[PDB]
């Protein structure tokens, strides 16, 4: 089976790509540059993690008048999935997104996944399916798996503000702080 992984540079999507590779699937990555504030550190993290995993990454660009910062961006994850399908050529097999539990975002919830699954399946007569293996996990579980993955934590980046050093107050930075990461 073929698997396209939406990669953001954080531990979650890296753990997904490691799992799919460990299952024996043919894995490739997808990074979306939509003008997010953290596009530069996220892209660097994705390039490094993909080079370690030995997978190629297709970069999809999108631009519109916006001031994307931290916090919820309405429609983001459903746009990342549809970008992977329409622009990333993920028309068969699996497309993976590293959403998990504990967030305040609807598009990280099980109802979001069930709808995205239906959308992808119905557009491909079922030949494509959306998968999110960490759907019911919380960040400490993901951190445990990432420590078993062999991937370097120093190469990951998750701050939604895009600043180096990380801002420390966005939801993802406070995830790292609560994990000593």
């Amino acid at each position: 089976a073929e698997a396209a992984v939406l990669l953001s540079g954080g531990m979650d999507s890296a753990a997904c790509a490691h799992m799919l590779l460990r299952k024996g699937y043919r894995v490739r990555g997808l990074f979306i540059d939509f003008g997010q504030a953290a596009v530069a550190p996220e892209a660097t993290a994705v390039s490094t993690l993909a080079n370690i995993l030995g997978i190629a990454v297709t970069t999809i660009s999108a631009s519109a008048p916006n001031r994307f910062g931290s916090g919820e961006l309405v429609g983001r994850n459903a746009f990342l999935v549809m970008s992977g399908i329409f622009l990333g050529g993920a028309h068969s097999g699996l497309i993976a997104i590293g959403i998990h539990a504990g967030t305040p975002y609807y598009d990280c919830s099980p109802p979001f996944l069930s709808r995205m699954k239906q959308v992808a399946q119905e557009h491909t007569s079922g030949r494509l399916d959306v998968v999110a293996p960490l759907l019911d996990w919380h960040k400490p579980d993901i951190y445990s798996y990432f420590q078993r993955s062999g991937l370097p934590i120093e190469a990951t980046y998750s701050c939604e503000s895009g600043t180096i050093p990380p801002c420390g107050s966005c939801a993802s930075c406070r995830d790292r702080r609560a994990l000593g990461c």
């Binding site: 699937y25 097999g93 998990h100 967030t103 007569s125 079922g126 494509l128 919380h138 939604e160 609560a178």
Partner: protein, 283 residues
């Protein structure tokens, strides 16, 4: 992605197990796609034109459902034919022979006759399926016997609810007929009855609109709906399952057990991730 500080071997095995199921689902979908290749790739524009070219009179029923699937080369319902050809001689096996002879002269194409319909094979390989009808309109089928269903209402329901299913209802019906065709002949429901069950099953369908998801839904729905005589929403009978008897007869019970066993075999094949068991269901 962030939870804001809002806070494994079993979880890992569960995740790999689910990924395996999701990968198998996409594999079976490719199996279904290949089985539906001839229907989905059929030049319906060319079929409609050639129907006008060859044509005692054609019915006003827009069908063009003649593409074969899953190597089942049978014609037993409206969802298997391209058009009705109403015979005008005031005199079922006979009206087929009329349509066969008249078209053999008009045609460019070799005409043949089958158990129920007339197959016009053009030079490029296109097989158009023509169901002989008679005016009183009725359609054949029980050989040598005309059916009692209203051919117009069946065509209206099939097209309306096929449109409401993005043209996936007829593919699902054709896959279901392929599964049922591998059973004993006396333990097979009629093609018209299967189509009426599919109309009733998918009129209020809320699930995923793919043949892979719709096919188990049909058998799960029909194992219950076959227990009672078929009606429309008004409650008026459609006259398609009188051969089974009254509600909860022994015949309808026997069909319910078989429709339920095909559904269990589908669930078991998917749970076992068995591609050969899924192919055995289609022959």
């Amino acid at each position: 992605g962030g939870s804001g500080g809002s806070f494994i071997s079993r979880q890992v095995r569960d995740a790999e197990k689910k990924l395996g199921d999701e990968a198998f689902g996409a594999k079976i979908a490719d199996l279904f796609t290949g089985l539906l290749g001839d229907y989905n790739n059929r030049d319906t524009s060319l079929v409609r034109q050639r129907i006008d070219d060859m044509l005692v009179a054609e019915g006003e029923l827009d069908l063009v459902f003649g593409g074969s699937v899953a190597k089942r080369t049978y014609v037993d319902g409206l969802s298997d034919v391209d058009c009705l050809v109403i015979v005008n001689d005031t005199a079922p096996h006979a009206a087929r022979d009329l349509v066969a002879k008249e078209l053999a002269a008009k045609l460019k194409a070799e005409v043949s006759a089958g158990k129920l319909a007339v197959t016009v094979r053009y030079g490029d390989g296109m097989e158009i399926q023509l169901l002989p009808a008679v005016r009183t309109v009725k359609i054949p089928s029980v050989d040598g016997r005309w059916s009692e269903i209203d051919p117009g209402k069946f065509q209206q329901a099939l097209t309306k609810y096929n449109k409401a299913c993005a043209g996936k209802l007829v593919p699902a019906v054709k896959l279901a007929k392929a599964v049922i065709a591998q059973l004993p002949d006396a333990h097979q429901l009629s093609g018209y009855h299967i189509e009426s069950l599919a109309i009733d099953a998918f009129r209020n369908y809320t699930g995923t609109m793919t043949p892979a998801a719709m096919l188990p839904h049909f058998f799960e729905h029909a194992k219950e709906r076959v227990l009672r005589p078929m009606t429309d929403r008004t409650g008026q009978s459609v006259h398609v399952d009188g051969y089974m008897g009254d509600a909860h007869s022994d015949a309808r019970k026997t069909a319910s057990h078989l429709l339920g066993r095909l559904a269990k075999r589908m669930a078991n094949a998917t749970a076992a991730r068995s591609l050969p068991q899924w192919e055995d269901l289609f022959g």
